[PDB]
Design an enzyme around this catalytic site. Structure first.
Site, PDB file in Angstrom:
ATOM      1  N   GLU A   1      -2.473   1.445  -1.247  1.00 29.79           N
ATOM      2  CA  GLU A   1      -3.201   2.100  -0.155  1.00 29.79           C
ATOM      3  C   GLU A   1      -4.625   1.581  -0.047  1.00 29.79           C
ATOM      4  O   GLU A   1      -5.581   2.386  -0.059  1.00 29.79           O
ATOM      5  CB  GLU A   1      -3.067   3.588  -0.326  1.00 29.79           C
ATOM      6  CG  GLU A   1      -3.721   4.198  -1.533  1.00 29.79           C
ATOM      7  CD  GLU A   1      -3.167   5.567  -1.959  1.00 29.79           C
ATOM      8  OE1 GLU A   1      -2.033   5.955  -1.537  1.00 29.79           O
ATOM      9  OE2 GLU A   1      -3.831   6.254  -2.788  1.00 29.79           O
TER      10      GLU A   1
ATOM     11  N   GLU B   1       5.703   7.830  -1.638  1.00 33.02           N
ATOM     12  CA  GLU B   1       5.198   8.885  -2.498  1.00 33.02           C
ATOM     13  C   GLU B   1       5.300  10.209  -1.789  1.00 33.02           C
ATOM     14  O   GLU B   1       4.560  10.505  -0.843  1.00 33.02           O
ATOM     15  CB  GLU B   1       3.788   8.682  -2.981  1.00 33.02           C
ATOM     16  CG  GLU B   1       3.531   7.373  -3.682  1.00 33.02           C
ATOM     17  CD  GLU B   1       2.117   7.169  -4.177  1.00 33.02           C
ATOM     18  OE1 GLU B   1       1.365   8.124  -4.100  1.00 33.02           O
ATOM     19  OE2 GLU B   1       1.864   6.029  -4.651  1.00 33.02           O
TER      20      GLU B   1
HETATM   21  N1  LIG Z   1      -0.880   5.979  -4.328  1.00 30.92           N
HETATM   22  C1  LIG Z   1      -1.646   7.217  -4.773  1.00 30.92           C
HETATM   23  C2  LIG Z   1      -1.055   7.576  -6.076  1.00 30.92           C
HETATM   24  O1  LIG Z   1      -1.276   6.338  -7.047  1.00 30.92           O
HETATM   25  C3  LIG Z   1      -1.626   8.794  -6.778  1.00 30.92           C
HETATM   26  O2  LIG Z   1      -1.076   8.863  -8.160  1.00 30.92           O
HETATM   27  C4  LIG Z   1      -1.192   9.868  -5.820  1.00 30.92           C
HETATM   28  C5  LIG Z   1      -1.720  11.206  -6.254  1.00 30.92           C
HETATM   29  O3  LIG Z   1      -3.157  11.334  -6.158  1.00 30.92           O
HETATM   30  O4  LIG Z   1      -1.950   9.593  -4.528  1.00 30.92           O
HETATM   31  C6  LIG Z   1      -1.492   8.371  -3.787  1.00 30.92           C
HETATM   32  O5  LIG Z   1      -2.418   8.348  -2.783  1.00 30.92           O
END
Ligand SMILES: N[C@@H]1[C@@H](O)[C@H](O)[C@@H](CO)O[C@H]1O
Ligand SMILES: N[C@@H]1[C@@H](O)[C@H](O)[C@@H](CO)O[C@H]1O
Lengths: 786, 786
Positions: free
Chosen positions: B179, B347
């Site tokens: 990101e 995610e």
């Molecule tokens: N890609 C990041 C992750 O690496 C992080 O662990 C997760 C929680 O904060 O946030 C996302 O924006």
């Protein structure tokens, strides 16, 4: 005739103590043809009391035209509403303002007053405030304002008087104004009030200065060369001396105090029931100034509080809110117990969140009694609507998820209120029982101001919302660590009161008065156990160097500045015995001397010192509520309690099961709650007695609370314990509720056999005790003593 | 041997479409003797893919000292983990950084690099940033940083290449960095980056300016008199032309893009599987600049997204979040579907909230497929622990309420993931079905930047978090009014694409480019239906007067400044036909001309016009999500939809039952959800059917989601509809799930009778349609065709 009295934690009506379970029904915002139905629905919910405002601008819509009988609109029939509430068996709490807040036009103040007399309006430092703002602020002490309020009171007071419980009506208390806070402007120190009666030569500011300080005191305190008091101008920015800002705040509190006294003297002459008030100043710690002023002027005011957590969004009453609730109930009950009036929540959020989850409502409501407040009014209980021209904050609507809708619908939190009200009005000895914590938190009023303002000058951050009160606050950590706490005012509290606790936690910024630093020294020297963080004070109340505490303790705390920019606030790890890398936020200070007990890498950042039979733990970091599998924050609390010898009266096997023992004479009720809301199971010990015995554990399937009886007796029969709430005990029938699992264990002495309805006995044991396990397919079951 | 391709909404593996259901298992943070057991727990959850970072600083702890085999620590054995994941039949998504975020020290960047070469650090405008901040920011384009990253990639890329699916291993994608957002500094426009290589004469800013604009262009755009590009210094404050600030923002995005391309060129050489990236910029509407850049440099990158809503507090995934999730899914799928790559959430929050309520988790996850994203990875799925020296944001812990705890325990959202993943992988035609809204929202990328900054120079407020995105945002109101929407980029979108919607909502500030104004004119002229609020633009992209849209519409809008001080923000009431005193906040502008449709007292403040073949509703106020009994904000949306002829393909009797139709080729699935979470009952009309017919309404007892089949068929047999999710149909056995009530209605064509398992038939009918009502005591039941 009728009598309204009070003793301990309850009001006493005709010689019988009563626990208040109230709903707000603002008659003026509900169709008159519905009042009777809505009062019957309140009866169905177990409520004994109705709360209502009386709005000046509603009953006097034009100057000189008063309507309390419904002549011009059926919802102006105050008289009829009071007669109906009485006929239906309710007490009434009446709140005639003049300011009533209430998301209502001008908070109840008439436009005809403000339009004709704009000189009463509060002003800013550069001119008038805008007129299209909500609750137009008014200069309380302007005589033209007060004269007009007096005319309101002269109309409405004879109606109240006629309907006082003492005169055969329903009314049991009359409230002053509504949470007087300068019209929700006190939060912004330079928005208000610069009205000429305040700021002119010889005006109220100058007179208050002269009554509180010598000119030389002010020269030293503000670092100025003043030749006359008239030279000390009102402050208008944060560049002015911090002492002067604190004085400006306390000046405002003084004006509110005078307004309240003015109203009180008129109410006291007219009414022989308790005269009440809600949340003076919309502050908490600053209540010290309210209670002191009451004592100074012999004002017999019953101070009441409120709990509001979510606005114009879904509810959000989960474990995150515990810190704040523990803090607020703590400081409330500290002052009210000393005033000798009953603790009461006159507004307990039941509306204004878009969707109220019943388990969250249950957590909020059910934690108030173990936190010291058994008398509870639900606001807004009966949904309403705003008559044309009286809207303010919600347009037409005054039914934002109330328990009873404007249409008479019942929402899910209605049944929560009903169940908890039944328990509170019926369970013997519950209201009178008291939490007796081993730990206290020390609050210091000036810091509340600084937090309100977001003040930035100091070495330490003033973001107490983050480090103390909120979702990660220290206070939430203490609650979720199963460390109940009293909160005390550090300026007012006596040494003997402090030494009544096994451990005192004090959050310090850069400055702390000489009186409080010296007191803490004496506390420790005399056997007290202190925990102080994230620094020691370096200055007194005048920002002059002063460090009696630090000098006594014999440690040194590095100077470092806390950060405000979120991107720049550090994420750091502190280690201690049995604590490998616990997260801390923001700048960490070395702590040299004593016995080092916490480390940032190889550097000590917390220390332990002993003095006589007392001790202190000094931490150079902000300890917060974070949780995880490793759970180091809770664990660190437990290590500090073990270090200082603190032992609670209870223990739990499951750290998520939060226990608040409400102790009475010879019995207790343990509030057992599941704030996190995930299924939990575990055992509890209370004073060495482990429960349950036959069941594997107390199971709480979701967020909610039980009040478990321990030692509750009548005659020769005792409920040694139970894993269900004892709701009531009438003749030989015990009614129990367990809405959180399908089975309950009861242990009885003095009875040989029982008959169970609403469930089946599936297990049991003893000679010592009659122990039974009941499977119940509903929440409620009955045990009949034979 | 293996192939990884893609078409439509899905990756296609060895010729077959697959739906991704993943979990993150960061092998480097999980004991190596638990890897197998954890992966087997992931297979029990129905997951087919495992995600992991590879951390530069973990496998290269000293410069030149690489460990991918566990030669120095068991959790350095990347090779072993890949072999294990492959043995266990998982696909792997690998994310080798160099930045990995991850709450890990420096986001993966070695301390030995930053300590030796501080010149690569990003600088503030006043000096260095502090060294103890999280994720030390780095000047991406500094040649010394890129050389170091190159050496990392020269070591890990051969490992990754060996394990690619195309080379007989498990790896199906490799992602670029994480990101990239200038190390979480892009949000603060003047925090970074003033490294001399950017700010110097002839430096990266000046070169970007000259590539993008002539000097004459910049004179116009900045209202300046420059004779050379070297006179145009980098901004460090808001006392700069607004266009210049927008260009500084865009220049940073360009630097990120260059960095991405540098990485991509290396990856593309080495890897013949999809090269992916997560949430460029940590922005959304600014994706236009990333997709444009991809096109301009012919980069084939698969953009993936993420959903995170609560940090270090309890979960809070309720109805309030729907506006933001509709927005973000909308703009994501707008871009990704044009790109032609699969929509995927790499995610999907499953950790880092202190307690995750399973109903809130279910709402978050289950709303993704109907909002266009059927491929879902749950992060962090497997709870872990940080090796000493590698902590950052959490201290020791990496197990903050993961579905699988560090110790292998299961938390309540495990079962939610399992049930959803089984449905996504088994329900025929579900992943390929598409939402096709009647309405679109028009997003304008400059306004995103201003909302990030909290910019104060304009007539209108830049608080779009409040008025558009958040709990009371316009987008939440749209979602909760049962108005699905697409989100289009106003700058990029064609007329043709606009005209395919039956209504377009555009939130406007003071300025709007000539291209966009003129495109809006053409849209309404060609038959489009516009809703625009709370003003019309008066300026173009250079802040010069330009009002083509207003001029075409033939209305005049009062000039009034919106307020920012919360105490001063107005509470006002707007009326319309059917709509008595709907709440609005902040300044309200008269709208003169056209047909008046909304009023503040007697003043028109909203108008309807018919111009060319289309229409426009112009509102002088901010329409927000407030709800109540009266429900006037949803009702006002409904009124505007009616006015402009917008008719959804469904109707529902309960407005809290949110319906998202997923349309397939010859079938559909109706996502039916209860975001408020209170018990709801209602009926649905869809595809000429009434649902249910026999059963007394569809009941959703709590928060959660069903995917109701319509027209799902195999041969002559067809599920006309059901009120349970059809999870799978294998042979003649249909497996249903309804976890939200105890009754379900099935309607079949082509089959005369069935056998039920898991329930009892309690009503039914025939003839061309076999309808059965099943009472089931558990969530799952089966219907066998006879
Ligand atoms: N890609 C990041 C992750 O690496 C992080 O662990 C997760 C929680 O904060 O946030 C996302 O924006
Ligand atoms: N006393 C006020 C009420 O009058 C108002 O209705 C409630 C909800 O905002 O806030 C309390 O502070």
């Amino acid at each position: 005739m009728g009598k309204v009295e009070f003793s301990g934690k309850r009001y006493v009506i005709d010689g019988e103590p009563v626990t208040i379970a109230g709903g707000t029904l603002q008659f003026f915002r509900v169709p008159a043809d519905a009042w009777k139905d809505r009062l019957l629905k309140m009866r169905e919910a177990g409520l004994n009391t109705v709360d209502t405002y009386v709005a000046w601008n509603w009953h006097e819509p034009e100057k000189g035209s008063f309507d309390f009988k419904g002549e011009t609109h059926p919802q102006r029939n105050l008289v009829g509403f009071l007669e109906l509430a009485d006929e239906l068996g309710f007490y009434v709490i009446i709140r005639p303002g003049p300011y009533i807040c209430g998301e209502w036009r001008n908070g109840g103040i008439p436009d005809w007053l403000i339009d004709e007399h704009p000189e009463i309006l509060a002003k800013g430092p550069n001119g008038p405030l805008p007129r299209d703002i909500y609750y137009p602020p008014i200069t309380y002490l302007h005589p033209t304002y007060l004269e007009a309020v007096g005319e309101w009171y002269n109309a409405v007071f004879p109606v109240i008087r006629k309907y006082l419980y003492t005169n055969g009506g329903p009314i049991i208390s009359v409230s002053i104004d509504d949470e007087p806070s300068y019209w929700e402007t006190i939060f912004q120190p330079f928005l208000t009030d610069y009205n000429e009666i305040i700021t002119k030569p010889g005006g109220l500011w100058e007179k208050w200065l002269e009554q509180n300080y010598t000119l030389e005191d002010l020269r030293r305190r503000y670092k100025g060369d003043f030749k006359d008091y008239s030279e000390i101008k009102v402050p208008t920015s944060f560049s002015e001396p911090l002492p002067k800002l604190i004085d400006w705040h306390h000046f405002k509190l003084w004006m509110i105090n005078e307004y309240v006294r003015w109203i009180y003297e008129r109410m006291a002459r007219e009414f022989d029931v308790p005269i009440s008030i809600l949340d003076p100043y919309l502050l908490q710690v600053a209540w010290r100034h309210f209670f002191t002023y009451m004592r100074e002027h012999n004002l017999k005011i019953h101070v009441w509080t409120e709990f509001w957590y979510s606005f114009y969004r879904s509810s959000d009453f989960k474990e995150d809110k515990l810190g704040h609730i523990y803090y607020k109930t703590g400081i409330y009950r500290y002052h009210v117990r000393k005033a000798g009036t009953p603790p009461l929540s006159i507004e307990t959020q039941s509306s204004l969140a878009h969707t109220i989850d019943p388990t969250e409502a249950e957590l909020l409501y059910s934690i108030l009694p173990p936190l010291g407040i058994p008398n509870i009014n639900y606001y807004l209980f009966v949904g309403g609507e705003n008559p044309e021209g009286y809207e303010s904050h919600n347009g037409i609507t005054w039914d934002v998820y109330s328990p009873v809708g404007l249409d008479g619908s019942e929402r899910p939190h209605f049944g929560v209120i009903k169940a908890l009200s039944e328990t509170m009005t019926s369970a013997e000895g519950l209201a009178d029982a008291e939490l007796r914590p081993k730990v206290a938190v020390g609050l210091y009023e000036p810091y509340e101001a600084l937090n309100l303002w977001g003040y930035e000058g100091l070495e330490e951050s003033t973001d107490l919302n983050e480090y103390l009160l909120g979702e990660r606050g220290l206070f939430t950590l203490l609650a979720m660590s199963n460390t109940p706490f009293d909160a005390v005012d550090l300026e007012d509290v006596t040494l003997d009161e402090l030494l009544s606790y096994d451990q005192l936690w004090v959050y310090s910024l850069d400055f702390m008065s000489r009186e409080v630093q010296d007191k803490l020294v004496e506390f420790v020297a005399r056997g007290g156990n202190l925990v102080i963080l994230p620094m020691l004070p370096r200055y007194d109340e005048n920002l002059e160097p002063y460090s009696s505490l630090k000098d006594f303790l014999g440690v040194e705390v590095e100077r470092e500045k806390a950060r405000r920019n979120p991107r720049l606030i550090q994420f750091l790890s502190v280690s201690a015995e049995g604590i490998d890398r616990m997260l801390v936020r923001n700048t960490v200070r070395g702590v040299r001397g004593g016995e080092p007990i916490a480390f940032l890498g190889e550097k000590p950042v917390g220390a332990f010192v002993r003095k006589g039979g007392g001790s202190a733990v000094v931490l150079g970091f902000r300890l917060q509520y974070y949780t995880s599998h490793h759970d180091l924050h809770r664990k660190f609390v437990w290590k500090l309690k073990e270090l200082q010898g603190v032992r609670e009266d209870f223990e739990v096997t499951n750290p998520d099961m939060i226990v608040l023992p409400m102790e009475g004479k010879g019995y207790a009720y343990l509030a057992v709650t599941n704030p996190r809301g995930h299924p939990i199971k575990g055992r509890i010990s209370y004073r060495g007695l482990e429960v349950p015995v036959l069941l594997d554990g107390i199971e709480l399937k979701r967020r909610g609370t039980l009040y478990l009886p321990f030692g509750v007796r009548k005659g020769d029969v005792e409920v040694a314990y139970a894993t269900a709430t004892l709701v009531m005990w009438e003749g030989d029938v015990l009614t129990f509720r367990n809405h959180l699992s399908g089975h309950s264990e009861i242990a009885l002495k003095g009875v040989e056999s029982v008959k169970v309805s609403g469930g089946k006995i599936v297990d049991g044991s003893d000679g010592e005790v009659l122990r039974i396990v009941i499977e119940h397919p509903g929440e409620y079951f009955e045990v009949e003593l034979l």
